[PDB]
Amino acid sequence: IDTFSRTGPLMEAASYPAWTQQLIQDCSESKRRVVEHELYQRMRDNKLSAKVMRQYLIGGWPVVEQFALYMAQNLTKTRFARHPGEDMARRWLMRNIRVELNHADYWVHWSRAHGVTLEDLQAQQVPPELHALSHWCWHTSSADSLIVAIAATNYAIEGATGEWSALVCSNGIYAAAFPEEDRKRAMKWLKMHAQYDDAHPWEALEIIVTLAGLNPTKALQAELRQAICKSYDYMYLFLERCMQQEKTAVTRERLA
Amino acid sequence: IDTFSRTGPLMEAASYPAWTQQLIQDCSESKRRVVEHELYQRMRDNKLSAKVMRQYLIGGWPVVEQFALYMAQNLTKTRFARHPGEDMARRWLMRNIRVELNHADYWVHWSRAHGVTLEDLQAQQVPPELHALSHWCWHTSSADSLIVAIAATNYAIEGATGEWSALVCSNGIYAAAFPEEDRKRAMKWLKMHAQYDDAHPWEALEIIVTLAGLNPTKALQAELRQAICKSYDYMYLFLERCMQQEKTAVTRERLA
Ligand SMILES: [Fe+3]
Ligand SMILES: [Fe+3]
DSSP states (O other): OOOOOOOSOTTOGGGSOHHHHHHHHHHHHHHHHHHTOHHHHHHHTTOOOHHHHHHHHHHHHHHHHHHHHHHHHHHTTOOTTSSTTHHHHHHHHHHHHHHTTTHHHHHHHHHHTTTOOHHHHHHOOSOGGGTHHHHHHHHHHHHSOHHHHHIIIIIIIHHHHHHHHHHHHTTSHHHHTSOHHHHHHHHHHHHHHHTTTSHHHHHHHHHHHHHHOSSOOHHHHHHHHHHHHHHHHHHHHHHHHHHHHHHHHHHHHHHO | OOOOOOOSOTTOGGGSOHHHHHHHHHHHHHHHHHHTOHHHHHHHTTOOOHHHHHHHHHHHHHHHHHHHHHHHHHHTTOOTTSSTTHHHHHHHHHHHHHHTTTHHHHHHHHHHTTTOOHHHHHHOOSOGGGTHHHHHHHHHHHHSOHHHHHIIIIIIIHHHHHHHHHHHHTTSHHHHTSOHHHHHHHHHHHHHHHTTTSHHHHHHHHHHHHHHOSSOOHHHHHHHHHHHHHHHHHHHHHHHHHHHHHHHHHHHHHHO
16 A cells, blocks of 8 residues: 555654655755854854845845745646645645745845845846756756655755754844844744744655655655755755855955 | 726726726626526526536536646746736735635535545546536636736636525525535535635736736737636536536436
């Protein structure tokens, strides 16, 4: 039968099959170097240059803006009661498209708190390293099977985002640095992803496991692993590019 | 500027521009012959043959099943803050995809109350006249602009469905004919579309008007009119085919 039904708690890796725990293990270094990135330890501490913060906010906009579109494209692949896990996916995507309703507006507000306008977001004047993640996300959402594109997006990106957003919010410095009257509106995107988002990536994982079952082929497993690590590696490419600019910007001002 | 902002109540035609009132007028006969169809006056009265009810339920399944997919495909066309009406559309589609969450399950339950199984729904053994509407809906959702495909679906179909569902429920006969213990579950799809759905088609219309503005080209107007009437005409083709079978089925039993 090969059919998966979770018994243990949603949030624990041990509630899933061995192949799923292996997938988590094989992806863990790719994830760690994003979710512990120096860029985020700096952001947490209010250290980032104006130039880099602006690049970060412009750069990350398209994935945010397009996020419910990735989901829409995956929902479009589904057919009612056709395969195990496919109904769960369809329902989940229908619920979670709505959960994204205001998230783009919250990014616009975060951005504005750093002097980045809607016009600047739309203009997308940032280096190409910063756009690669959105292109990959559209590509897999458009062309890959649902299970792979959900893994790339709702598992990989959302999971990483919950963790880096929490790191940014973890010691109160970044938030206290905003004036009080501006803070709630500026911090809203981060608080929504740092606090409220815990179960989401695990719900996506459970769907992916239900789709794949207890014994997926090695090839399917490799496809999931590669798609997940692609998402993490594009986040890492974006962060590395930002830090190279940070190092330049800060150096110029030390020497001046 | 050409920009539309509604002042009057949502539900009244007079709250919209002249071209929109004209569009309603030009489509009204196409709509009437669906929403007043003899098939529905019969269904209201519990008159339909078993054969036709079964064809109706199998036949109407794909549009129901696929409905949130049509919306998904239109959401995929949208871009944030790019054109007047486009944000309204994006938000609306994000909210309304969730509203459809259980509607397919409710159709499956309605169907089962008439002895039609999930297997029968999936098998789609009905005449080709009954499938044309789903093909058109996918086609416009896949290939036409958002404004046209929303008009074809969320305006035309949902509006017609609110009215025919209300006619079916309007005198209590159809519902009282179900045994009491089965009735709630059997009637749920109909009650959700006959009662709760009033504002939806008018919300879709308002979006379409905001997108088109106060002065759309004649060509855009004709495109909307043709797409709306295509949806109504495919509903009519489906109903006419059902009634031809009804007339045969009932005649055979009168003569026997
Ligand atoms: Fe979000
Ligand atoms: Fe519905």
